Amino acid sequence: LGDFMDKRDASIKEQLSGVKDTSSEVKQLEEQANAVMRAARAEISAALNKMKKETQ
């Protein structure tokens, strides 16, 4: 019975941690996506400027 109690409690605590783990993983995913999108935009802008300046 002691083992059963432990198993159930661990299963629940583990579920909470995983749920906590998943939330952090999704926050990281969102941050990475945001950073990547910024790079695209900024990168291209810089490119044109440098390219625009060279053309000029």
Partner: protein, 41 residues
């Protein structure tokens, strides 16, 4: 070794064991169940 029968030794004990089993299963299930709920929480 042999059993000794008399209705004086145990009638006092039956009322006590009944009161304790009833009010003990009440407060014991309430406490134990509450603890289980907290673990589930």
């Amino acid at each position: 070794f042999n059993t000794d029968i008399l209705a004086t030794n145990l009638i006092n004990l039956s009322v006590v064991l009944g009161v304790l089993i009833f009010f003990g299963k009440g407060v014991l299930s309430d406490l134990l169940d509450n603890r289980k709920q907290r673990i589930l929480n």
